[PDB]
């Protein structure tokens, strides 16, 4: 299967049937060695699936998904399932490195899986995760915030057995999830992605001040002024007392103003230089 990439020797079995699943919050006590020299060691409460943002190899989170409460194990990770080709510089680990870890799974809470969730449970796990996400947002842990928000959109997609009331709630969570994902992507300077989320949001509320402004901000951030000017221009029509727009629109006009002056002289010079070659062409 993974052909011995994640090799694990169990030191002290863990009484319990339970094992963590993706999304499970876990309490671990880990020790990381690169050629028996320690390079990682700490007790952390993290969510399976976010380890990459806490400098955990993913073979390690994979290995945690096969442990039991209180268990003590040693995990052997080939370079592929470790920090592979990049290594981790803050841990002096270089490209293509095998790793050994001594983790000890203290406790955990499996995460409810999409299908286990009845209709109103989804409107609930979703609101929970939105908050979890905003929290991450405010701490500046933007990448970790994306994992929470994305969850919402997914969960509330196919599920349609909605009471028309529940429907609206689900629709608002989706609009909220998207506008929030755009904020993240903007903070990560992932503009092309900020526009996608904006568009998705807008497909929900085509007049959304937030979606419009952010999309407009993302275009501008990428120097796509014409499209940028289009969104702030719309934000104004819809929402005149809008500080950012009025200002951002200005920026767009100035740059677009310059842009034309450049281009114009360009054609002028190309024109003239062209006429030149032409006359000489009169042998």
């Amino acid at each position: 299967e993974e052909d011995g990439g994640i090799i694990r020797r169990i030191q002290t079995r863990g009484e319990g049937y339970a094992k963590p699943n993706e999304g499970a919050i876990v309490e671990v006590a880990l020790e990381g060695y690169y050629k028996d020299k320690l390079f990682d060691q700490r007790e952390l409460r993290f969510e399976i699936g976010e380890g990459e943002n806490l400098d955990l190899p993913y073979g390690l989170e994979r290995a945690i998904q096969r442990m039991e409460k209180g268990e003590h194990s040693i995990v052997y990770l080939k370079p592929s399932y470790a920090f592979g080709s990049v290594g981790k510089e803050k841990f002096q680990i270089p490209p293509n490195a095998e790793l050994k870890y001594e983790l000890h799974l203290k406790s955990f809470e499996k995460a409810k899986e999409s299908w286990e969730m009845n209709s109103e449970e989804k409107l609930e796990q979703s609101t929970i995760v939105k908050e979890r996400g905003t929290v991450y947002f405010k701490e500046g842990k933007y990448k970790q915030a994306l994992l929470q928000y994305k969850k919402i959109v997914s969960w509330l997609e196919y599920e349609s057995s909605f009471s028309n009331e529940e429907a609206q709630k689900a629709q608002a969570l989706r609009l909220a999830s998207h506008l929030n994902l755009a904020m993240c992507h903007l903070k990560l300077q992932a503009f092309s992605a900020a526009i996608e989320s904006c568009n998705k949001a807008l497909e929900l509320d085509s007049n959304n001040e937030k979606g419009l402004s952010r999309r407009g901000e993302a275009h501008l951030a990428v120097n796509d002024f014409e499209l940028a000017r289009a969104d702030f221009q719309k934000v104004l029509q819809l929402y005149p007392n809008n500080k950012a727009a009025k200002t951002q629109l200005a920026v767009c006009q100035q740059r677009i103003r310059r842009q034309l002056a450049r281009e114009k002289k360009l054609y002028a010079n190309m024109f003239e230089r062209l006429a030149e070659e032409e006359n000489k062409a009169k042998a």
Copy 2:
């Protein structure tokens, strides 16, 4: 190209050094020859870009884009520039064939490049091609309808010199262009395209009655019932007396029901097969 694919032999020089551009309305008289046998003789008038829908190899189109008014001429085409991998059965023409055309460029008329038009011209012209859309669609020439609408969306893409009132109209055009493409893709049974197109429309009007309907139609067509349901539901909780929504909603509501029975029964059985092993697995 740039390797003897379409070679043209002038039988009578032109007069205007003016050459048709993509999307231009040319008027031509032609003759097609496969292994020197006549297979197509016609005097027609078409827009450069729809030749493939009028049984014209795009080689012939590429060539035509190089002639000048009143220019009689002859074109030689190599497989990948004529028909190629498939040939033309209505013309009895084997794959990879090579052809000779005796085309005469009677008259024509280039087509505003886009930067060639100001705000006004752009809205003027988009309204006009919007119209052409109408007919190609009325007559069942859907692919041809697509080239027209796509034109609209293209022309009003970066241009934002608009003036709020104008911008309001360009908005409506883009919206009407996206809703029609959805119609053509649907009649063409390009259900994903219909969906993308509906999405671009809804992003311009999250409440559109057609946008949601045609997207619901698209989902129902390709069997994604849980989704087609969501669109119809939202359609009726916005437009109560909406004829089609109510009916098809039933369809979705019905199909999903059956599906549930199948799945539950299925799960019921998988369970018992498993219990069966559970049992014999003792001894």
Copy 3:
């Protein structure tokens, strides 16, 4: 490996224990069958390796090579060795088809191979082959001519044990062979290959009137006015009395002259357009 692609049922015994090789000249009588239907009956003698230009499926030549003199055989070709992808129209053989040929290997003369020939022999054979090359060239069998000229370049490549007058004799040959190859490409309108074969001629004699001209016709053929003018300017300085040169040199001078008038006007216009937008941008 062929994996049963070519299957041969020997009907009558051959003799000699010898077999045709790549390039052998064979005399064979054959008949092609598709679903027990006769679709090709002939008696011809050709060179192993030119069969394609004769409507003889790739596989069949690979079979004749495994046949003895006086042998009568039935060969079965899996589609991929028949006419494979897209068959053969003149025989009405459709795409992905199996064929049955009945052929009789009458006579043949195996062919000397690069390693068997000493230095005198390569120069001897290189001239024979060149003869064949030219015959075919006059019968219009261009691809078959290419088949021959190409042999010269190869056979004379790595060979270096020459003795001056031989080094010369050979250079004369490579040169003659690159130039003819150029004539062939120009006739089959394979312009890039023609340009290429010309450069390999000029590497051996950079003032070669024919080499410069032909690369001039090809550059000029694919509308590379600039580059062609250069060759035709050079051909004339070295050979002032070259008519085609003066002519062709005139055509470029003209097409280049019109091309520019066309471009100058383009910029004149984008300029004006850019200016009028500069005023719409003072509102």
Copy 4:
């Protein structure tokens, strides 16, 4: 999903919950039209998954899997889900052709699916299918025989809850399935594949006369004499009174005998020709 490739209009609904699944034996009454001209029409009892060997497009078998007893429907198949790029020559259908069919599902029997099969049911459905397969074999319908035998191997792979008695039965079915698959592949002149099946068989009974001989036959069929001589040579040791082996071994010796005589003269001539270049190399 398949994006409208298989479009079906139901003419007369079919009372019944049931629908066919792959492997289901069906009774159909079909009519095939290429541009409203009939090209296929017949009533057949066939097994879903074998249609390709009865000239049925696979979009058609796909469409049958969504019908109900007695139902009458029309099925629209785009060229992709029809006879695509090859077309069907016996039906005059050319590459890239859409198709319309008027089939009528008279009756069917869903096929038990692997997981429904308890342990001894698998030893049963397997023996049934082996016979079904041999039958096909004898009629010369080799490709259709492969589908049945392959079923066995698959079914009896992971299932291991075998009573040690059942085990042997399952192992014999597997050995039987493999040696049978080799016969097919040999008859289809799919030698590379005949060896795979042989090897698999041999991994079950390393002394198998049948597996050895066929593998030996497949090597020989591909001119891999050394390996061929190895297997008949083994068959003899194991089973001396073996007609084929003794004879086939002979063939191998003769060809291998010739092969060496050829090669040897080759090196002799290469040697001598080499010495030649050498002496001359004494300037």
Copy 5:
């Protein structure tokens, strides 16, 4: 290559025009320099092909294959010929680096090419390298064990001039070669390789006690319990008092049990979630 990757500068000419071939035992004294700093100094003796296991770039190996006895010399290596994409951390060497080696080819000894040996030599030598296998394995140098055994399987692959008695021994060698590779792959945790290797062995001895055991081990390692079970079962129903089989069989028997509980419970739940929808799906 064939583009300045490994350039060698002779510091002292050789004496024998004899050059080491792959698999040859060379004896060398070398010095490695990265940006002119010494990082590796050693006088060792190794077999051309295992250099990568002795921290030698294969550039250096390729180069060494070109020298002659007693030849002092210097080699320049370009990234993709030195270490390259990963570098050498034990030598502190960044990716893409370039190196300079001052190697001296003291002595060596080519290695029988294969066609260079008759039946006897082949069995003599294979027994010998079989032995070398033994040691590299005893010392934990598994990769190095692999090159040895692979050699055996290679040498006795097409050679069948054997004489039944000999052929019996070559059989045993191939069998022992495949069972050892299974051992090395397993200690290397290349479980698929271990399985292929076991399969090649069983095809030579369908009853092998190790073959089945090591394959069972391989399956159990990568968690395919239903299969590891089958091998152990068959192992004990052939070798009753087989220590390991009995135990691990238990393991498989246990793990599969748990798995069943999980699946059944899982199915149990999926069922009820479905019934839940079934219900609310009414109103």
Copy 6:
């Protein structure tokens, strides 16, 4: 699109409304940061496009180009524009890394571009650049020399409005430029590129002593004895007093002489072996 790859925080304003272009000569003071750590502090003036040869990350040059004179800025580069894949060892910048540069654009002179220069100018600039080329060549900055010579070939390519003495002047330039480019490749041991640059010289003067020699050194460099002998034979017939020629011509004569003695013996042996097997094959 870059999508936020290059992010610049302008600290102090510039002036002039002008910006450096590809090939501009700039004066800038910079400092490179990685995790707030200083890893590069300098004050240099270089040509936009040679930055790589100076340890200036690709992205940074693309930034300087967006800077004004006298401007002070902070630029943020996403890993893919930093040193990206595999970083930079001398700065200890590890694979996949983000960098922060603080640079001050002091002065610069934009660069004339192919279209701005009339015929006299290209010949003027082609000489300036060639000068730069040669300086760098003497300082050993080979890659930087390549950067320059290459400009000549390009700039002089499509230009054809020359007036004989100009056509000549230019040919002298292209020739000088192909030959120097050859010297550079030989120094960077990029032999295939050297051979290539030589052919482009000989196309313009097929008796060029330097061109023939250098292609001789390269052919000889990669062990193409045959081909190199040819060039060294020719260089000598045209220039009897060429020492390196006579020398090199001797080396090939020798390496070729030994190569053959080596090959002859090979065949002698395979011959004997093939004979001894012919006797084992009489049993």
